[PDB]
Amino acid sequence: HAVCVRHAFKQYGSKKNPNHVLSDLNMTVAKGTIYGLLGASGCGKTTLLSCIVGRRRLNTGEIWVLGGKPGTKGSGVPGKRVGYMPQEIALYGEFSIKETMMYFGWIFGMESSEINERLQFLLNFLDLPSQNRLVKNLSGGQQRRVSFAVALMHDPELLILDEPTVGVDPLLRQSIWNHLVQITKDGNKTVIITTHYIEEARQAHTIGLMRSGKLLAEESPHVLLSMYGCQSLEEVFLKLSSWGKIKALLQKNFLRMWRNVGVMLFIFALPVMQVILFCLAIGRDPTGLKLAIVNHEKNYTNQSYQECSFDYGCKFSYLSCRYLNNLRNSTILKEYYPDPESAVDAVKQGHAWGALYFTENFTDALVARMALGKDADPETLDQSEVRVWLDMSNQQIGIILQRDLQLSYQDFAKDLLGACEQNPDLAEIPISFKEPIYGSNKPSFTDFVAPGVILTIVFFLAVALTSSALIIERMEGLLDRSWVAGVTPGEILFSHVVTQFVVMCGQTALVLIFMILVFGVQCKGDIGWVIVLTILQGLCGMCFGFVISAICELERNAIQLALGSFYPTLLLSGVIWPIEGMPTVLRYVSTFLPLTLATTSLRAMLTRGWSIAEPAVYYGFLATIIWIVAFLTISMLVLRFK
Amino acid sequence: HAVCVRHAFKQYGSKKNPNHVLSDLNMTVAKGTIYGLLGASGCGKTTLLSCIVGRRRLNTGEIWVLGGKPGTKGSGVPGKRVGYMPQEIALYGEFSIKETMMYFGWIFGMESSEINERLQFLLNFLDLPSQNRLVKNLSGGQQRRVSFAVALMHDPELLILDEPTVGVDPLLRQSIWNHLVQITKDGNKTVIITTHYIEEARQAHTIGLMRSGKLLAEESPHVLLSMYGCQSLEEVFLKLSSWGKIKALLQKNFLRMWRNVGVMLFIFALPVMQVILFCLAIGRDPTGLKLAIVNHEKNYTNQSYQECSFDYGCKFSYLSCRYLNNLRNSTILKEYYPDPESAVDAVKQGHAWGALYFTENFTDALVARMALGKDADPETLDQSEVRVWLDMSNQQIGIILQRDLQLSYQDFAKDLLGACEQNPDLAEIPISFKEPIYGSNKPSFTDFVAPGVILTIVFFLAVALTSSALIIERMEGLLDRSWVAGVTPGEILFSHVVTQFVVMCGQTALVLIFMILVFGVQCKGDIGWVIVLTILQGLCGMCFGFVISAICELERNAIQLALGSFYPTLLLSGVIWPIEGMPTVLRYVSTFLPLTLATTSLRAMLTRGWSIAEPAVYYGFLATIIWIVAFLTISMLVLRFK
Numbered sequence A, B: 001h002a003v004c005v006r007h008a009f010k011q012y013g014s015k016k017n018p019n020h021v022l023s024d025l026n027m028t029v030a031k032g033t034i035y036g037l038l039g040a041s042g043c044g045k046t047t048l049l050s051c052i053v054g055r056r057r058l059n060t061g062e063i064w065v066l067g068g069k070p071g072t073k074g075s076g077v078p079g080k081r082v083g084y085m086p087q088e089i090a091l092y093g094e095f096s097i098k099e100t101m102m103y104f105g106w107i108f109g110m111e112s113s114e115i116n117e118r119l120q121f122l123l124n125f126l127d128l129p130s131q132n133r134l135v136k137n138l139s140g141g142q143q144r145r146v147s148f149a150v151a152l153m154h155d156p157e158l159l160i161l162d163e164p165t166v167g168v169d170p171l172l173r174q175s176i177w178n179h180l181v182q183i184t185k186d187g188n189k190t191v192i193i194t195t196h197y198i199e200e201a202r203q204a205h206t207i208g209l210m211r212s213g214k215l216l217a218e219e220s221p222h223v224l225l226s227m228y229g230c231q232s233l234e235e236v237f238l239k240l241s242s243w244g245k246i247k248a249l250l251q252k253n254f255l256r257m258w259r260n261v262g263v264m265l266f267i268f269a270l271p272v273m274q275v276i277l278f279c280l281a282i283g284r285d286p287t288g289l290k291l292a293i294v295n296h297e298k299n300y301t302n303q304s305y306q307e308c309s310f311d312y313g314c315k316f317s318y319l320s321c322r323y324l325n326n327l328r329n330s331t332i333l334k335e336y337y338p339d340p341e342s343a344v345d346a347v348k349q350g351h352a353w354g355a356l357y358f359t360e361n362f363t364d365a366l367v368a369r370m371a372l373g374k375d376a377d378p379e380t381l382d383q384s385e386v387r388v389w390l391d392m393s394n395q396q397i398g399i400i401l402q403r404d405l406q407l408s409y410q411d412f413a414k415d416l417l418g419a420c421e422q423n424p425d426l427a428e429i430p431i432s433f434k435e436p437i438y439g440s441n442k443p444s445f446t447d448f449v450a451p452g453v454i455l456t457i458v459f460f461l462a463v464a465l466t467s468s469a470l471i472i473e474r475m476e477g478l479l480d481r482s483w484v485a486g487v488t489p490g491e492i493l494f495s496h497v498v499t500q501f502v503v504m505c506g507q508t509a510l511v512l513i514f515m516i517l518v519f520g521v522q523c524k525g526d527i528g529w530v531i532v533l534t535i536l537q538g539l540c541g542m543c544f545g546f547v548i549s550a551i552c553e554l555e556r557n558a559i560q561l562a563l564g565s566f567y568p569t570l571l572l573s574g575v576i577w578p579i580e581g582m583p584t585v586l587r588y589v590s591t592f593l594p595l596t597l598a599t600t601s602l603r604a605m606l607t608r609g610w611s612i613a614e615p616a617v618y619y620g621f622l623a624t625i626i627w628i629v630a631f632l633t634i635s636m637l638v639l640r641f642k
Ligand SMILES: CC/C=C\C/C=C/C/C=C/C/C=C\C/C=C\CCCCOC[C@H](COP(=O)(O)OCCN)OC(=O)CCCCCCCCCCCCCCCCC
Pocket: A261, A262, A263, A265, A266, A269, A270, A273, B544, B547, B551, B552, B553, B554, B557, B558, B560, B561, B563, B564, B565, B569, B594, B634
């Protein structure tokens, strides 16, 4: 007595439009026979098979398969005692036939020495191509044969085949049926084959016709035909009235992505190129700025030559070419125009960014202004000044232009006095800036954004990898087939965490090497805690993949949910702008985001060298741990009623 | 002769592994007879049906179906004269049965009055639920029944069915076969049934057994049984040898988005939430900076109180509480500490951003410095200066603090002289900044990034919509089902462009209204040309979706390619940083990118008010036009060899 079912009541719905998928069902599968299930649709048989295996549960009734209640103690139905061929092809792509057979043998605890014998026997018997050909390269009919061979490997004592012969050649169908009737010859082997084709299940010892969630009849085909008088079976149906399984999953995980060139480029080559582009374009100071200089103290020759010469010692010859020599050569390029009304016309168009317009009386008026004091007449206060018309449409370019012009005057003022034996401190504003406590006097914007780029890449490259992996595998029936083989959900998750941990360590090493060793981003603090924080953000992002994959069943739905929170989090975590710019109400809400307090903590360890003991540093560690726990709890709650 | 195939040859794959799907196939179908095409696998029969309907082309041989070559304007195989039921369920989700019937009737050109009669007849004949139930809410059998009813509504003179009964109830199978026999007697209707059922296809008037790309035997069932002396058929087989379509497509496209709530929120509620968050967080000035002030001219009372009092007229009583009076109240908060050593300790932690430390004799040292100038002793110059220690780890905050500390001294200096009857023009540096030509003296960073945000949202939300729409729809054979119905490829492309153009028109209105009318981003240029440029970027993005959809065949691959180009373009088109920061070599390459010249053109329209006659403005219009053509050419070349 292999399988016994009594009063199996099962239904679907929410007490609004309920569906009675199952009804009062009594079914017995005698041991050592071939049992055929010939239901009309493909839902009742599938539900019954799932309940028999253990992947589903009843509402009322009992099931007694191979000795005990399915999925629990007292029996080994989920494991190496059963053979399950799913309705759909639940094979792994980018796998050779030999690799798939070896993987499934390892899952069942078989020895690798005896796997070769079964592989050769099944290749000869099922008429399959060379073992080195990948599964994805096979046709749609050979994949079913590979699935049948996988289900027939370990010689189980109960075979559950779901339409094993859909489009098999008759010369092979006869051989398959001969093998099936040969293995179940005075032995413990039992077959429970479900099919839609009525005429193909005549060789079964016992036939059970299913309709409206219950078995119409269950007898031998010969008795079924004789007691009703029908010629064929078509007329009869016209009734108007743990170590070893983890190593198997680790190899599969590290080989599924190795054979996908697109996956490797997306998760290993994209962070590297993004880091290179960010360090070469964002945060650098402008360099090719142009100015329209009008110098009326000298003759006009070209738009690129002026012949600005003077004396360096004393006597204050020109004091207009002398100032231009103190201009920063790196950022500002000088262009010469003849008239003040012509340089402004160049600024109006795109030919320049500003105008200077030194007057012809600049030298005589300037020397008469610093040598007079507070009694200077208004006339000398006008002729001794530089008139700058600036294009302030750009905020960042305007800041450099204003800063470079004023800074060059401080050097010019400190050069005039000092060359005449004076005190250079006399040309200083009373507001004196001492040595900065943190940083330097010339900070860079690329150093402010770099901590926000490291954490963003690692966080969002784990959401995409985890959500895609757990959705494709589940929707293709692979997770359900690798559970029947005895792989508990505990080791499915454990093997995924280890696989994701390794790839998030390789990404962290590549990002940190290309950012600090190359392009010279400063790291004042401890590098050990930087690595730990970066890894911790990867696990937080990975835990977000669990929530997304447990909510969305379709791939396209998950990406919208993942992309629908990627953009808002970037604009609220203070990655590209200081967090002090937002309103006070919006500032409080943003501190509770997953990436806000972690970015600030990482920015302090890189720009200031703060240790773990500082309150602003370990707040980023506690914020991630809370979000990791919160993400895990949400996923469990979602799976409770789904 | 309904169909005449002679000397058919067809090859698939490469030379190394050729695939001879057909080889010297001779087949003839009479008019008014049911024809059954039984085969071992489900690929050669599908290939033959695809060749018959005209989707494919033979490498050698001729086909004459219903009068002439398929799709040659001599015969009307693509259109009303055929009934096609694909192997897969090529139906539209979120469509009621009535809506599906109406859409397919409008495609064929039927009147809405006679579609109702056919719908009511087919609903009762096929035993289907109420017409208001959505297709996606039906089971597999009901969906297949709806697909079968779709092929029977317009009454074609040639029915092509691919496995019409795979899980149909036997009573319904008998009814369907009775109807099929009824419609083909004493008439011109011809039915070609392709099935794996060897025994169910017995009522067909002519059976053609297919094997190895050719027909083993083509004759009547009972004739075959009598000639070969076999009881059943499997024993014999066991031998060892034009505006109505656009209006129908436009309504389908719009209604396919209305019934997807997630899609509407992703393309119409995400840009609204992204614009609002960007305008409230990025670009605004910091307004919470705290400074640790050490004033030794007044007694220490609290950390929040100092009792800063001074005379406003003259006599220069304190000059330390007077300077602090001019400090801006918006950005700087005042804290008081008793010792300079106790103030730096607060800056070293996260309690302050700087220190000031006015000396105990600041008033007399400063007063004696202005009155006695150009000859002040080093003692006075050292005890009349303010010592500022700044935390310069943040570039944007450090700029604000330095700028506000020096701008406040100008107001203090212009108040000290002027209240004593002196001209305030004596307290200005010779570098005099006139009125800016463009912008103002206080620019904003959110105005620099706003032009780049508008283009990025519109361009990159059309790639996602176009690629997904053309990939999911093509994967499930929806294009193949509408092509057989008579919908030319031109009408499919035209209807999608119109639908996308209307979608991108709504997105432009929402983005422009919130950014300009609500958040007050100035538009100094022409508003008409801004809308034109924004729309032109949407078409350019859509054409990039054509390239992605023509290259990739799976959803998970298109987005990796789509996201693989979204990240680099953001860091190379100068959206979040001026293009002047990159090196010259990278600057030349980045110019040719799709969004580089367009962002510059839009920025000059909003920030400067330039018109279309300026070279820097219309260069972004030519860049989009060329990229539109290039993307269309690439998509045609991709489909040429693929
Ligand atoms: C903004 C616009 C910028 C520029 C404009 C345009 C340039 C022209 C368009 C150019 C695009 C170029 C090449 C595409 C080519 C061919 C793909 C189709 C053939 C087969 O590649 C399979 C599937 C798809 O094949 P599929 O049909 O789905 O698989 C079979 C399904 N049964 O491709 C994928 O996944 C690609 C996954 C992209 C990963 C994204 C991150 C990339 C990081 C940097 C890349 C570094 C490259 C280093 C080279 C290493 C060589 C080993």
